[PDB]
Design a binder for this molecule. Sequence first.
Ligand code: HEM
Ligand SMILES: CC1(C)[C@@H]2CC[C@@]1(C)C(=O)C2
Ligand SMILES: [K+]
Length: 405
Amino acid sequence: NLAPLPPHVPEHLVFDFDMYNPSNLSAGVQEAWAVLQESNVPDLVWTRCNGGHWIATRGQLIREAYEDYRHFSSECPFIPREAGEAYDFIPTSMDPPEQRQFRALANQVVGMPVVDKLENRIQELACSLIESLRPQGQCNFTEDYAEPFPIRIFMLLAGLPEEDIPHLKYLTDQMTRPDGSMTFAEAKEALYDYLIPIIEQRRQKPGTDAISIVANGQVNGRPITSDEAKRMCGLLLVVGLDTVVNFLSFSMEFLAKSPEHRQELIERPERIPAACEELLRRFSLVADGRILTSDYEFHGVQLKKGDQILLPQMLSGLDERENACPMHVDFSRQKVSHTTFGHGSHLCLGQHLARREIIVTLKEWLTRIPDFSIAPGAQIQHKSGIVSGVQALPLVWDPATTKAV
Ligand code: HEM
Ligand SMILES: CC1(C)[C@@H]2CC[C@@]1(C)C(=O)C2
Ligand SMILES: [K+]
């Protein structure tokens, strides 16, 4: 359904892109979004889909808008508007200066220092999961590895039982790729219904888990409030259950379809880190945005106070203006440019944990299962939203070609 065109939006800037069900989704989600970068498409367009909103299509504008928080506010970061209005997670729903004090505490529970403490656990789980699958000669990658690996590690640090995964995963997914059964607001309240008692429980009897640290934390010298802690932990759950999980599947789908690249990493393991960065660019998957704090002329386009603008983190690296032959994957690419982990004051705090999980996966999987492919006749389906993903990824391989170690 298309919303009536606002009086200030000129017809020549209309491009009805649906971020939750893009026209060319069958060609791959990144490819579907890339249509926004075709020759005849303006740098900034307006779509009448999902209530109506602007979409910056080039890395230059995306980066600029993310840096200018005075005009582009995070107060309402999601499309549709009802979702952005209900969205109140900390620190993502705040703009500087207020945002910074909470960011410092968040970095404390998901930052590099935390990764170091989880290193052995992360390594051990990846190897354990892969070894268990190796002899089967097949797997449903999304549910057999992409989900359990990142999620179990997260539940470990958050001190939450693994049996709670199904429910929490469902809720998080409704906030990024809603199936229609729940509005963002309904999913949020369900998430908070789960968290509130745990936070109070851990404020009374503090543990060493991430929820306890946040719950009993301080924000620039003063005690964090119960609601602030709740809004912070809400973000942690979403990010721990619906980010790396999706990216791993895009990366493995690609490797399953390209023996050449698998071979390159097998022969030269030292290239894994660089490969991780090139895959992060090519298979970027996030797209959220901002709301205009006032009327503002941006790159020749008149934006009105309250207008929502989608700033696809995914598009910057796919922009041929930033990377030549953007759809081509080259692990030796000289200057890999992207905004996969965001840009500006809200730059991803968990990117170190994400990269570690990606690199460990690449290394340990290729060491045990060097040769694999997409299951016979399988047609991989992608899903689009605030965070895009892969519906299912059935893989097959000959056990005789694997190495247990
Ligand atoms: C492939 C994996 C990941 C991607 C692509 C990703 C992407 C992003 C992006 C684009 C933002 C900024 C959004 C905005 O500007 O509104 C962000 C923020 C954040 N991310 Fe990540 N993320 C990933 C994994 C993680 C993980 C594993 C954690 C921790 C468990 C994490 C924690 C955070 C936090 C706390 C913020 C909010 C920072 C702030 O608002 O100041 N991220 N991430
Ligand atoms: C857009 C994001 C990827 C960023 C981290 C999780 C996410 C869905 C948010 O709500 C903020
Ligand atoms: K809001």
